[PDB]
C-alpha cells in the first residue's frame, strides 16, 4: 500500500544557483505536523541544476556517505555547503499510501 521508492542523484553546483534547493527539517526542527525529524527538499529553483531531479518533500537520506538520520539541521546544510562540484545525494519518495487508491506490485 505504502512505498519509499529511493535512489541517489548527483547533483552539479551551477555558480549562481548553488545545488538550486532549499532544505527543511532536523531534529531541532521537524519539518513535519507528524514531529517527522527528517531533513527535507522544501524547494527546488526553477532553471536550477535540480530541476527535473527532486522534488519538495524527498526525504534526504544521505549526502556524499553521510547519513541524515535525526541530525541537526545545522549539521545537514554544512555537509551540503562543505561539498565540491558535485553533490551525492540519496532521497526517498513516499508513493501510495494513506488517501491513494494505489497497491504497487
Not at 548553488?18 to 513535519?32: E, L, T
Not at 524547494?43 to 553521510?66: F, I, S, T
Request: glycine share 14%; charged share 20%.
Amino acid at each position: 500500500h505504502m512505498i519509499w521508492e529511493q535512489h541517489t542523484v548527483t547533483l552539479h553546483r551551477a555558480p549562481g544557483f548553488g545545488f538550486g534547493i532549499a532544505i527543511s527539517g532536523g531534529r531541532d526542527n521537524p519539518h513535519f505536523q507528524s514531529g517527522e525529524t527528517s531533513i527535507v527538499i522544501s524547494d527546488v529553483l526553477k532553471g536550477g541544476p535540480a530541476e527535473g531531479q527532486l522534488q519538495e518533500n524527498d526525504r534526504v537520506a544521505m549526502v556524499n556517505g553521510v547519513s541524515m538520520d535525526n541530525v541537526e539541521h545545522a549539521f545537514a546544510v554544512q555537509q551540503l555547503r562543505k561539498s565540491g562540484k558535485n553533490a551525492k545525494i540519496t532521497i526517498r519518495r513516499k508513493k501510495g499510501g494513506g488517501s491513494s487508491g494505489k497497491d504497487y506490485v
